[PDB]
Amino acid sequence: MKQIYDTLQLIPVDKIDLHEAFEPSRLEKTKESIAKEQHLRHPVLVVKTLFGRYMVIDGVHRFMSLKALGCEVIPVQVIQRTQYSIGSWHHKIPNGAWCEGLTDEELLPWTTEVRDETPFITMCDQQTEHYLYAADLTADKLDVWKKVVNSYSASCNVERVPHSACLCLDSNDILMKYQPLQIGEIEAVVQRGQTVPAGVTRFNIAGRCLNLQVPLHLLKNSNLGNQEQWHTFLQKKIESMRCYTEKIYLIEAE
Amino acid sequence: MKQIYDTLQLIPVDKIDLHEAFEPSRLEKTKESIAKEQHLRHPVLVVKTLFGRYMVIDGVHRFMSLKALGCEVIPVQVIQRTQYSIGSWHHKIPNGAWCEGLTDEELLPWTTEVRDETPFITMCDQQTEHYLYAADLTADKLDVWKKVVNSYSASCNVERVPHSACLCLDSNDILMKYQPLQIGEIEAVVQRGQTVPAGVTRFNIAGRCLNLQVPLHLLKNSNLGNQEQWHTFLQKKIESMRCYTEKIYLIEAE
Amino acid sequence: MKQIYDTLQLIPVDKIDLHEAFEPSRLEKTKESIAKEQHLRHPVLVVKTLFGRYMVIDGVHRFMSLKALGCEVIPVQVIQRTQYSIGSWHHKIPNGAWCEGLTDEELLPWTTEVRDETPFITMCDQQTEHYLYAADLTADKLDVWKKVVNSYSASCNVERVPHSACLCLDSNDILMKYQPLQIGEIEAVVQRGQTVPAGVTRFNIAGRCLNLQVPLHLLKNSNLGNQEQWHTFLQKKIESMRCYTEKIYLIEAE
Amino acid sequence: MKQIYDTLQLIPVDKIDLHEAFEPSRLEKTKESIAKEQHLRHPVLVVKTLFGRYMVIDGVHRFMSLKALGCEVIPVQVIQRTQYSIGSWHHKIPNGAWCEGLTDEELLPWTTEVRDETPFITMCDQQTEHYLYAADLTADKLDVWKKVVNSYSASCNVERVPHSACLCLDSNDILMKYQPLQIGEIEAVVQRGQTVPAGVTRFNIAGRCLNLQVPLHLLKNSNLGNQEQWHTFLQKKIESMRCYTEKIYLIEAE
């Protein structure tokens, strides 16, 4: 447990990259709550990446909220490569025929053929599968991916299901399956200045620190004096830290 | 997630049994903190037992603190049998030769013989094992167990280690091993009006609810009116509930 | 390891019990096969029972083949509790919607309420699960189990399905799910002179000895002695034993 | 399953590479055994390589026995990536404190600092772990690996130890720990015409075909053809194939 202290750091805001598109309603809600509370409940989870920088793997909305509220440093928890894995979320639309984004005039080259290579995107109903193969796309595969996801994401009662799960579709479900990305692929996206669609990458992260409740007043100055105050704050919080190994239901309110 | 609401209940204090001895310093600390905060951070974890009663499986000190502070009902989380298992803690004394409770005049019938039956208690050092066999004890096995545990528990820098763990002892460690109890054995202890020693039973519990922060003012009346207020409180808290599946480090302070 | 050698024993046929009804079609082919070969390829797997008897946990048809062939002694491997577990086979009726023996059961008290207590039997179709809870049974739990299984086993195509299988039922499927028995419960069936329905219990056994190839002649004339020959035989075979740990596909011919 | 049948193939000896140095004592006994029997009991397990070649992942000594015996063709089973994993064997030197080749290594830059990056090699005694980090190496990582292993393999008693083993070192033990290689890395060694030190790589392979017993005569005169005989042979053997899933002890004689 005595290593967590070392992973909780204040990082300059300009050193942090995002790889995932934000959700506008989620950002408004996160920003309003941070502004009201003037604390950050959970530190932003980051991994070290190229060029001395840090990449958010959990906390896009918290990060953007803190930035907009004028924070010059971000409370992060630095996650080591051995303590996370990357999977994907499948997206279950519980009544596809009432999902306007899916019943629209279709323009992409969906096909039912199974090929030797893995499909870029798979759309499933109870009886059939349609595929998009990377080899058939003209637009940047990233722009096609985002168009597909955003067509139904805010409007069709989507339920995210772990890509590894066992799921049986009823007679009107649609299931969207996406391929898991490796960390190197995500870094190439960031290097290009791009982001992946929201709610598709699924980081499984061991050892997250919760309920740190960092007061925003520690985050407004890029320089020091605040570092002694940060250490004092952290020492006090770590005194009350406890570890839980099984599944937990955390009440996130005061 | 929508089942947790049903498991969080206010139970009359007189319907709740303990099976484990409290630690006096731990009780003082828990009671002081509850009194200062006038909230219960985490609900007491209980299992249904015989006679319409409930048995604490986590929260002896919280329970006794609430009782002493005048609570007539206890916020519990009812844990189902399929969501916990019972193991044991081994107790590592990091310098046994400086542990007065272990270097005392010895009176129990320790033996190095390995027998066909399982030992009641095992004391290990780096090279040797000594056993206490239930078949050799005169005193109630429970009273012998408590004498052994309390001889070193508060004084010899004990480190609790999961009975299933891999541990290598250095040249001065002592390791005390205790047998896991089954739920039926624990219930027989309670039926006798007895308790097992502190810090030996190890419940592994899936799905615990944390940071509920129940205000003590909801707990002082055995009758109702408070039940509508309990439902309103619970509805608000459950709105902010989130599930975490991997290991977490929870900061337990405000 | 020499521990294995000691578990390979010749047991009087009269001391061996079955817990599972046999299939005569499988019995004829097993008997035929053993008769042609004059060797028992794989020893019967048994567990030690009360009264000094043994219970077959794998080898119902081998046992009765040898028994029917006049063997006074059975080559067994004695399995310890630590090296096996008891699961269950599900039963899929792919045309169950047309299975007469199943759709006319007006007498048994099936129900759809999910209770806190595990159900005795579960019957699933594409959109409904029905449950038999032990607390509602009108007659002996075993004879009810038997009646359910036989209502479709003899008049409807069936295939076993493992618990791990992710199976999505189509419009005419029925899936029967049975609760796994503990070892104590199976010992009860056998001591009432009975058996469980065939094809339901699933024993997961580690460390089976394969390809011992015991000549049948060792299994008769026990009244003259056979221990000398047996150990002479075992020592020669044991020397070529090799341990394999993952899933294997064994070619069983020469 | 018929998928297995298709993975059992006769491969020209010239298209098969080894990744591991052999032991001549084990080679003589393997050759002797195959020569006496005139059958290859278990097929060589290989993976498809670049350029259309194959790499042995189990069967270094069987391959070279057949090769030394003049076989122009090798009976292999082609293993897919999904059915194996690459681990490592630890090396225990029970009298390592007196192992001269190990206690005089003044040249290699061992270090005790634990860094965020996994180490290349780890050397353990009862109270100290020393590490070789790839970023400190003076020469080729493979030749350093080789030098370390050979410093004790030829002049000190050694026994392999599995990763899962809970091992407490005594006063004179030394334990060497090696980092598991990925498949890409082993392919590199072979394409540089080299091998890794013996007894370190640990392949966990699921679905091995056992007891095929391929007659040696099928493996010569390939210049006249052998596909007809091969399939005739496989169809007869495949019909007696049986799948076993847990640990088995196979008697390998008739």
Ligand SMILES: Nc1ncnc2c1ncn2[C@@H]1O[C@H](COP(=O)(O)OP(=O)(O)O)[C@@H](O)[C@H]1O
């Ligand atoms: N008729 C048979 N022909 C060939 N092998 C058989 C036959 N019956 C049994 N066996 C061998 O015994 C093993 C298990 O047989 P099984 O059908 O379970 O009968 P039992 O009831 O004796 O276990 C099989 O893996 C097979 O190798």
Ligand SMILES: Nc1ncnc2c1ncn2[C@@H]1O[C@H](COP(=O)(O)OP(=O)(O)O)[C@@H](O)[C@H]1O
């Ligand atoms: N000398 C031998 N005698 C008997 N069986 C052998 C011999 N060599 C190899 N085998 C068979 O091959 C299997 C693996 O042999 P192994 O020692 O790993 O050599 P290889 O390098 O060919 O894998 C063993 O399980 C054994 O059944």
Ligand SMILES: [Mg+2]
């Ligand atoms: Mg998040």
Ligand SMILES: [Mg+2]
């Ligand atoms: Mg639907």
Ligand SMILES: [Mg+2]
């Ligand atoms: Mg559309």
Ligand SMILES: [Mg+2]
């Ligand atoms: Mg506790």
Ligand SMILES: [Mg+2]
């Ligand atoms: Mg010590």
Ligand SMILES: [Mg+2]
């Ligand atoms: Mg004492």
Ligand SMILES: [Mg+2]
């Ligand atoms: Mg069987």
Ligand SMILES: [Mg+2]
């Ligand atoms: Mg069907």
Ligand SMILES: [Mg+2]
């Ligand atoms: Mg080998």
Ligand SMILES: [Mg+2]
């Ligand atoms: Mg030693």
